[PDB]
Amino acid sequence: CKVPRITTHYTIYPRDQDKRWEGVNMERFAEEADVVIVGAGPAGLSAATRLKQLAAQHEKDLRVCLVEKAAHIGAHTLSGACLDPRAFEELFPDWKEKGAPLNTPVTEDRFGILTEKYRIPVPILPGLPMNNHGNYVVRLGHLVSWMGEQAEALGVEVYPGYAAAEILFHEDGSVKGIATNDVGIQKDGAPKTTFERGLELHAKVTIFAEGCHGHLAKQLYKKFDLRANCEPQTYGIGLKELWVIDEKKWKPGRVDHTVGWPLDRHTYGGSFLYHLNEGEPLLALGFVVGLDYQNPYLSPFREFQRWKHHPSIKPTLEGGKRIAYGARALNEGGFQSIPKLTFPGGLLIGCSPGFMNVPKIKGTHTAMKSGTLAAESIFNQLTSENLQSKTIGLHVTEYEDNLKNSWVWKELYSVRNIRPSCHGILGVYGGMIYTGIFYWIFRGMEPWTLKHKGSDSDQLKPAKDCTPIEYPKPDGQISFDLLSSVALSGTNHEHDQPAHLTLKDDSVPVNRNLSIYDGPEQRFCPAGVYEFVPLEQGDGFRLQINAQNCVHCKTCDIKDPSQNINWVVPEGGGGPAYNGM
Ligand SMILES: Cc1cc2nc3c(=O)[nH]c(=O)nc-3n(C[C@H](O)[C@H](O)[C@H](O)COP(=O)(O)OP(=O)(O)OC[C@H]3O[C@@H](n4cnc5c(N)ncnc54)[C@H](O)[C@@H]3O)c2cc1C
Ligand code: SF4
């Protein structure tokens, strides 16, 4: 075999055009519901939950199906988790007696600027966006688990292990619903004796809650020109691990943040370190890097691992034990990047569209609120008559009206010029100055709205123009390698199936990427999926994709300079097995 025809997924090579599928029967069974939700995350659950609450209250019949990639609810949830109860309490005011895991109220807020050798404390005032009074630090994965339970209790039909891989359209052109991934296909594309076609879930309205950079929404944006009046979404990559530390250095309810070292003024990013108070002396810590970074030699992961060695942070994990690892991409575009949320037959909610309060690093509370509103507005239209036709799929335009008048809108508006102010000659340090001027003093009142530099993908410089970064070697106690890390994420997929990291053209990673940027996919991926392998013999290399290690963070679909990669879902159930991350 060859070069090696790295891509074989049906989305790029339709099996309706390859002979090997000549006699297979593609007939799918189908299920009818009123509302189908895609993604069992905080938003998707909020929507599902609220819809069944409304149904019960006015006692009417509502079938609500919720699909999820994860083997089980919460398995794919990754966050640091500092929660603003606002939307959650709205949905579950009775939460304290029903068991929800909000057990760590924030007690101390800290923030510092790091240099190679020192930590410079920054005062945090009562107006600023890094305040956390009345907020809780949680284990998002557990909370989501808890929510799924309530949902199930309310009568929501949850289907974990089922990934939506196809968008179903009606003949008029509106969304009819989705189809779950098929199963039983070999790495090469050929159907296995165990081939089975996925499920078809038809609804009047489909909710898309795929989170940050969902793959369905990605094609949804094109189909209905949803990004027509906004700037492209900009992202960051968040790396995280869980630690068990010395009870002596545990300070429950403390929330830490930092900026600076090991990053250079022009690379947006920082850490977060949260002391849980759920029983064990447990720490939730991480690092974020803005995927708008310029140097091809930069590695988010090596930066993270390198960060824990700062003399202000190392002592705290000194003699501790790391028990988990994971990564997820997050939104940073904020206000300027919110697209049109509705189209005939479906809605967008949560971080798929993007309601992230970047400076606060909070996107859970808004995510939930959007789910609440979505649910209310959809109930409002199935409970009425007044037909909007020639779109067999409803267009719940009222969802967007209501979202714009909620606190969500004004919250994101108020912090819209913070991230953008980081593109000055002072990089993020200038952004800090902006926060003290225009926000602490004017609470974001300024009569203008700054713009983003554009897509994160064209922000990379050619390798020959940059200097490579010399990262330390992991000591195996504070900093670890990539493979032990992937191991601690619990991620796994059936090996015999086409790689879900699809390529539009199998030649650009070697001709363009390795050539010009020196293969950045080998470093921006936090799970070592892409590697450039020497060729059997002659010269050059070949790209080897170890799809089995993918932790579904979506960073590659975002950062690839050649926008040649398109993340798609692998058989349902595959992926990380996160527990309380
Ligand atoms: C490092 C880091 C730190 C953070 N810290 C905070 C913090 O302190 N406070 C805060 O409020 N927020 C924080 N966030 C943000 C928070 O995690 C998100 O805004 C929030 O989870 C977004 O939620 P969502 O409901 O849209 O779904 P997500 O949690 O993004 O979940 C989407 C779900 O959909 C499933 N899914 C995706 N595509 C499909 C498909 N095709 N078919 C089926 N299922 C699918 C996924 O498996 C996933 O379970 C942080 C994020 C990161 C990465
Ligand atoms: S291959 Fe998977 S894990 Fe690696 S960056 Fe791309 S999405 Fe993230």
Side-chain angles (χ1 to χ4, degrees), residues 1-387 389-581:
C1 227
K2 54 120 90 206
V3 93
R5 230 276 164 145
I6 328 154
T7 300
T8 55
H9 202 290
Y10 51 101
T11 47
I12 284 174
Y13 292 102
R15 29 217 211 304
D16 105 311
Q17 284 166 200
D18 92 278
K19 20 261 183 120
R20 303 130 99 220
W21 287 81
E22 192 67 59
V24 194
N25 168 56
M26 252 65 176
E27 234 172 47
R28 303 164 189 150
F29 285 173
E31 292 273 335
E32 242 151 79
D34 293 318
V35 182
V36 179
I37 309 175
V38 182
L45 283 163
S46 291
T49 291
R50 182 79 257 225
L51 274 180
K52 269 295 190 183
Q53 283 183 329
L54 254 19
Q57 192 210 163
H58 304 75
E59 66 176 53
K60 322 212 86 54
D61 288 11
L62 223 50
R63 201 196 170 185
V64 181
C65 304
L66 188 313
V67 304
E68 169 60 81
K69 292 192 296 96
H72 80 176
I73 309 290
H76 288 186
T77 305
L78 191 113
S79 183
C82 169
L83 210 233
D84 178 314
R86 165 110 87 144
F88 181 63
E89 291 186 327
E90 189 184 312
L91 198 55
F92 293 106
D94 40 89
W95 74 260
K96 180 79 125 122
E97 54 175 42
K98 280 201 184 179
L102 275 56
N103 306 289
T104 328
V106 187
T107 61
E108 182 170 12
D109 265 324
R110 299 201 311 157
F111 187 90
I113 304 180
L114 307 184
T115 63
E116 189 174 291
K117 303 144 145 65
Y118 321 87
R119 186 192 117 107
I120 304 172
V122 174
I124 297 182
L125 297 174
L128 300 178
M130 273 291 42
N131 150 285
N132 296 281
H133 183 70
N135 285 307
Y136 303 92
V137 0
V138 312
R139 293 188 50 173
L140 200 57
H142 284 159
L143 175 56
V144 176
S145 193
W146 184 88
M147 275 189 256
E149 254 171 46
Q150 308 296 129
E152 291 196 76
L154 262 42
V156 180
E157 283 172 58
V158 187
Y159 300 75
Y162 288 82
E166 187 176 307
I167 305 176
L168 269 51
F169 303 88
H170 277 310
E171 240 1 274
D172 54 50
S174 60
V175 173
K176 176 219 280 283
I178 57 85
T180 70
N181 63 293
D182 286 356
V183 186
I185 296 179
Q186 36 195 77
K187 197 128 145 86
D188 76 355
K192 300 175 174 169
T193 44
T194 63
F195 180 65
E196 270 196 273
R197 273 239 105 184
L199 216 314
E200 280 202 8
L201 288 163
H202 301 185
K204 301 174 180 183
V205 54
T206 297
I207 294 184
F208 295 77
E210 294 178 301
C212 186
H213 205 94
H215 96 290
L216 252 30
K218 179 176 175 180
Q219 47 206 88
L220 229 40
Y221 291 147
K222 269 106 137 192
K223 201 70 159 48
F224 305 87
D225 211 344
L226 312 178
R227 320 283 312 180
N229 285 95
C230 57
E231 296 195 69
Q233 194 34 275
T234 124
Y235 312 77
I237 186 192
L239 300 116
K240 167 189 184 179
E241 34 193 61
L242 262 189
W243 286 67
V244 183
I245 60 167
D246 199 352
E247 200 256 313
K248 291 176 194 130
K249 331 219 78 218
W250 177 47
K251 313 261 102 124
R254 159 186 278 188
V255 165
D256 277 3
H257 290 95
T258 53
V259 289
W261 194 86
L263 271 29
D264 73 307
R265 88 157 98 87
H266 288 296
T267 302
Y268 181 69
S271 78
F272 73 79
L273 192 161
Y274 303 168
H275 293 234
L276 271 319
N277 177 57
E278 293 181 315
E280 319 184 76
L282 195 63
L283 242 66
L285 56 75
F287 204 73
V288 181
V289 174
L291 288 186
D292 69 308
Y293 67 81
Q294 315 204 83
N295 194 329
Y297 292 119
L298 184 143
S299 182
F301 175 79
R302 296 302 281 275
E303 288 297 350
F304 173 31
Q305 292 311 310
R306 180 194 186 188
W307 166 70
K308 298 178 286 176
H309 273 274
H310 188 271
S312 94
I313 291 130
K314 184 188 174 203
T316 296
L317 322 143
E318 192 118 72
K321 153 185 188 175
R322 160 233 225 184
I323 67 188
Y325 172 87
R328 231 298 193 185
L330 42 69
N331 301 107
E332 303 203 313
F335 187 80
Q336 298 94 321
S337 303
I338 303 181
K340 179 154 175 284
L341 329 169
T342 85
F343 52 84
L347 312 166
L348 294 179
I349 67 170
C351 270
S352 186
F355 303 119
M356 175 85 186
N357 183 311
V358 169
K360 269 134 141 270
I361 313 175
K362 300 185 157 58
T364 303
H365 63 289
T366 52
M368 287 173 189
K369 185 62 180 187
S370 51
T372 295
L373 301 178
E376 295 180 334
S377 297
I378 291 178
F379 186 63
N380 258 346
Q381 197 177 172
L382 305 168
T383 274
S384 255
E385 224 181 3
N386 303 260
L387 273 46
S389 62
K390 261 157 86 35
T391 49
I392 311 170
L394 287 56
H395 195 167
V396 191
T397 79
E398 32 290 4
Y399 162 39
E400 197 172 352
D401 283 316
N402 288 306
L403 181 79
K404 295 189 208 220
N405 299 285
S406 64
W407 49 267
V408 168
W409 208 247
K410 279 292 163 242
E411 185 174 342
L412 291 170
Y413 186 81
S414 60
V415 286
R416 112 217 81 150
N417 293 314
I418 300 198
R419 246 253 62 170
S421 50
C422 295
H423 311 318
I425 188 178
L426 285 179
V428 313
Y429 294 100
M432 283 196 270
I433 293 187
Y434 196 99
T435 313
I437 291 188
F438 275 109
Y439 193 81
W440 181 58
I441 291 178
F442 297 90
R443 307 308 193 201
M445 297 202 87
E446 12 180 300
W448 63 78
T449 302
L450 308 188
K451 292 183 185 301
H452 295 308
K453 284 182 294 215
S455 313
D456 303 300
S457 66
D458 321 309
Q459 238 54 228
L460 267 188
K461 274 178 188 269
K464 37 226 155 62
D465 297 317
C466 304
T467 294
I469 306 176
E470 263 285 297
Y471 295 107
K473 317 207 179 68
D475 65 4
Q477 314 220 84
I478 280 67
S479 40
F480 310 81
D481 58 277
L482 204 58
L483 291 177
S484 44
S485 299
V486 182
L488 301 193
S489 69
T491 168
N492 67 265
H493 314 67
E494 158 71 64
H495 282 184
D496 198 37
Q497 72 174 306
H500 53 292
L501 290 302
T502 70
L503 305 181
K504 295 205 193 75
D505 177 356
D506 298 353
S507 60
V508 350
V510 179
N511 289 329
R512 252 245 254 169
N513 295 176
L514 181 55
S515 191
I516 287 75
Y517 314 92
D518 214 46
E521 47 268 86
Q522 58 187 182
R523 19 177 114 69
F524 61 55
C525 165
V529 164
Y530 300 109
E531 67 175 309
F532 280 119
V533 155
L535 214 32
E536 304 67 66
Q537 215 52 55
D539 245 338
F541 306 70
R542 45 171 274 249
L543 179 81
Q544 160 145 271
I545 297 182
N546 305 306
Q548 76 274 164
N549 296 159
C550 179
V551 303
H552 309 198
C553 76
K554 315 305 194 72
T555 309
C556 73
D557 193 304
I558 296 170
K559 195 62 176 159
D560 186 16
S562 310
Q563 290 293 274
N564 173 53
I565 299 173
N566 185 53
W567 194 97
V568 126
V569 286
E571 289 186 8
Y578 295 130
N579 178 55
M581 298 291 281

